[PDB]
Amino acid sequence: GRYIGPVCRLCRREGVKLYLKGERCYSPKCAMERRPYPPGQHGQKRARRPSDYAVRLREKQKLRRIYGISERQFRNLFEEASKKKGVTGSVFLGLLESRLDNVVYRLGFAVSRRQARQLVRHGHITVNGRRVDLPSYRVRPGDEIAVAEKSRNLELIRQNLEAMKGRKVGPWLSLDVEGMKGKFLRLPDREDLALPVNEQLVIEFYSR
Amino acid sequence: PKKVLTGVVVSDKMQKTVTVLVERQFPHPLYGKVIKRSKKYLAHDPEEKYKLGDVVEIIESRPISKRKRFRVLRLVESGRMDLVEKYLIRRQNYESLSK
Amino acid sequence: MVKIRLARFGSKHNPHYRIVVTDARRKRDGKYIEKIGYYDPRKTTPDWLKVDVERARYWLSVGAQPTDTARRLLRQAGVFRQ
Amino acid sequence: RNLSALKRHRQSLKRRLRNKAKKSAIKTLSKKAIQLAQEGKAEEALKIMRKAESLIDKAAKGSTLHKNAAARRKSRLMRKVRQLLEAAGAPLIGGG
RNA sequence: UUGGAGAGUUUGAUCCUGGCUCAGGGUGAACGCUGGCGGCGUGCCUAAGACAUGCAAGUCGUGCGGGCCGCGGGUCCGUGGUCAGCGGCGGACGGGUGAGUAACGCGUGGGUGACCUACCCGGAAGAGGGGGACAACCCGGGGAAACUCGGGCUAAUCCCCCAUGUGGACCCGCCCCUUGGGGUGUGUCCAAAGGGCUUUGCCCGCUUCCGGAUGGGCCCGCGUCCCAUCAGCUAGUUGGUGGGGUAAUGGCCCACCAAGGCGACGACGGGUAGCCGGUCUGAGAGGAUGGCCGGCCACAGGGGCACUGAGACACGGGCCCCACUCCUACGGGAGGCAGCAGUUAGGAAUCUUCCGCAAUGGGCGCAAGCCUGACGGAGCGACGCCGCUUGGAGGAAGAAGCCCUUCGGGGUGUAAACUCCUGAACCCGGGACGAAACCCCCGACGAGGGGACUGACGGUACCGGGGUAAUAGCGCCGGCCAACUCCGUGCCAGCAGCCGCGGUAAUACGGAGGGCGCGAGCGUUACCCGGAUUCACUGGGCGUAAAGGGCGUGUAGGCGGCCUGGGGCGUCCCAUGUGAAAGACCACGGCUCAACCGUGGGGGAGCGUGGGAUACGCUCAGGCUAGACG
RNA sequence: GCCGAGGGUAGGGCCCGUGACUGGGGCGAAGUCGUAACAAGGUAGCUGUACCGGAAGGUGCGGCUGGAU
């Protein structure tokens, strides 16, 4: 299925911190904060300049490994935005975002997307009422995403809403803390989201 | 409508029957250029009044014999041997194409 | 006789009929003469039955013969009404 | 190891007899008439012809000959007959 | 204007030409390793080789007469179930397969004054009077069987004669029309059936005719692959006349008569293929393709033929011939899976001898209802697409083991251990949507209103409660191309798509550590398009790279100067018909999403018709002298 | 009685598989013989044709420069 393995080796390769755990990403026990160099026997050697192809694959796995997403779902989501109207780059990001497993995390229901999945797959989430255990739901404007009442009294979701008391959440999302319910206002302009990614280059990876 | 064609009589050597050659132009579907193709029809001349070189009109009709599906509609022109000679000379050239 | 009946479309465990006029000798989902509406037996949509009623009557005035569970679907949409 | 298709073949044979039977008769009196009108003898020729037409249209009632067949047959019967009388004449009965 | 990337390889080096090769997407796939769940699709591409067994087409007692058994009750009657029979309607639908066919088979636009259509609707009219056969059944003869002949009786919606002629048909005549269309007069010919209830009234049916609707037949224009190392082909051949034949035209068939018909715009011949909507690829143009699904065709062991029929030259009907297999009582007789499963053979390779008529649909029936391997579902197969799992947070300047090291240390690695949190699987309870009709009821057997019966999938999905940390594999790491070190080997063993690697320090072979790429998948083989502007219409070339005919002359053909008018063929525009459905696309909506599916929207070419335009190319006509000749 | 599936007789056409033996061709190579071509390649080369020679080739005739000086 999904990646499901050692995750610090990921940031270490990408050269950048991706926020793939939650808590530890912020402490100084974070791997990039100890070793900002690719994992394995040859990480401390001096790099050799990567080729154009080398560069693009790398920018792709960057954006991709963020989301914990399979290449198929990535490709298909991409090859949607390739077909659908307007500028490709924004729409790909947009459709990436409308994922429930993402939506849950951007709201702070979860500390990671990886946790935001187990939250989704274990039904602890609901969309406009109905229980939803599908990480892949394309959330639409006007949707209200909340916790199930039948699980609302759980240590993890209560404790994880504790941080959220007045925490900022992106412009297109609102959040009734304590009440455990959030709202999807619209899909992003590239501005709204600052993923550490040059998104044009991913198009060009696929232009090959 | 009963498809009406215009063409030249090039042989009347049968009883109550003429050969009306019809020509057509259209542009080549891949190569653009307009090209000439043509065809011979057997037309029913019950009134055996038509001669070699006549340009006439023919109309698709109920079957008369095998092959014969058109009757001659009306005369259009007379004495166009220059055209029959076009047809007749292409035939004569076929002798120099064998072994 | 030319008949009025329900050509099945949709998918498995997802029935979706097209109320239609086709030859009685056609295969159930074959090429037909004219479409005159649809019908969804699971009623999972606001309008699970719609009928151009002016049309169906043309055929009736000329000899189309409704199936039993089509006769009903025209009755519920009141084509038989006076 | 069987069915009702047998019943249907048994039926088809019995209708077969009946069909042939008329056709031979029909063709018999037709020629018999046309035979006479050729050497006519107009009255007998015309008389027998009435039993031809009769036996024809009756065949037309059923499976034997379709409507246009009986029509087709009569137009070749009469047209042959009358014009055979033009070689002599005159038509002594009806008709017509 | 939503659409277009290139690289490796001839050289010491260069530029160019040119091929080879690669990275992409795709498939009814197959093979290797591996393999957890579900949904929707989908699965003999080879031998249209051969097949055990069951099942795939029957139905009506509201057509008739019966035998048996039963309930009734007096040998007889009603009546029930059943079995054949006679008679209806169906069996020409549905389902299968792609052999044959290069063809009016298909696609597209049209013709039919040259045609048909059972059941259905609508319009007009009618049902009078007699007669008769064969099965059932009885009685003989012959077999293991297939069953079979003869003799005798019997009913009907079974066959036949007369009558009626609204009407129809046919010949002759006139009018209209204009290919055999419409009308009419003389003559002639043709109708029919009862059954059942609530019974001087309705319901199912019957007969003649007209129109409708639907399904067809036939005909024409145009489009449809390779070899010209197939160049000439043709005796029913091509036409005429007269007949035969059919619903109907026609050499479709026959007789006679004429000497004709076809061909480099590729006849004839050989090869290959069912065609299309579409599918795949592609920036487009184009290329490739036709499995699933929808339309048409063709075929039903191989051929030929007809019969019954509105319709067939008929898959589960008939006759014959052939090949093949079988059964036998050894005298004789039967079969046709390219229906659904299943066996076998061939093959790299392709499924359960399932459940059900509940639904949709079809056939019979007044109706109940009966039949339905169509169909609705279920089974099997990672074959395909889609969703989903093997957990999440915390957790050392960082355990052991293993790899590397200049022996200081670097790495696997937050990875593990361990802590808390969640709760796939499984256990308990609830439990579908899909199914309201037919029928019954009042009303009127109608309109309308009311009633009850019915679920294969299935105790499944789903809803609620409880609850276990719960499968990961495969390819690659010389350049293309993302990923590097140690050892082992020593032109050996081996790798290989191309260039190339291996001859004692191989990042290229074998293992390991580490790393890169995907993930219930990953790789391999085969094939299709792409990269290949490498058949070049878009969009290439020929002095020396592959490429000007040895030179003339001329046939067909392609192409053509300046001015004016007629026509309007090409060309452009407008209006209209067709361009089915599914699919594609855009929006929305339903399955928790998605795959899948529903609803609506938008078109196009191309062809038919009507009207318009006249510059260019065309044609016709009249001039000119710049081209050409004298 | 005609036509007629097909069976039988006879002679022809195209294609496929195969055949003692035979002709050259591709590849392999660490073999034998010579040295024809590339330098004026030690007789300038190539060429159509003709005759000849173990083999590359030679020579005649005419042609070309894509021949050094």
Ligand code: SF4
């Ligand atoms: S710790 Fe630093 S490296 Fe490890 S996951 Fe969080 S961010 Fe990426």
Ligand SMILES: [Mg+2]
């Ligand atoms: Mg981030």
Ligand SMILES: [Mg+2]
């Ligand atoms: Mg760059």
Ligand SMILES: [Mg+2]
């Ligand atoms: Mg776009």
Ligand SMILES: [Mg+2]
């Ligand atoms: Mg961020």
Ligand SMILES: [Mg+2]
């Ligand atoms: Mg691409």
Ligand SMILES: [Mg+2]
């Ligand atoms: Mg031609």
Ligand SMILES: [Mg+2]
């Ligand atoms: Mg004729």
Ligand SMILES: [Mg+2]
């Ligand atoms: Mg029967």
Ligand SMILES: [Mg+2]
């Ligand atoms: Mg006789």
Ligand SMILES: [Mg+2]
């Ligand atoms: Mg008949």
Ligand SMILES: [Mg+2]
């Ligand atoms: Mg009849």
Ligand SMILES: [Mg+2]
């Ligand atoms: Mg453009």
Ligand SMILES: [Mg+2]
């Ligand atoms: Mg490219």
Ligand SMILES: [Mg+2]
């Ligand atoms: Mg090289």
Ligand SMILES: [Mg+2]
């Ligand atoms: Mg070279």
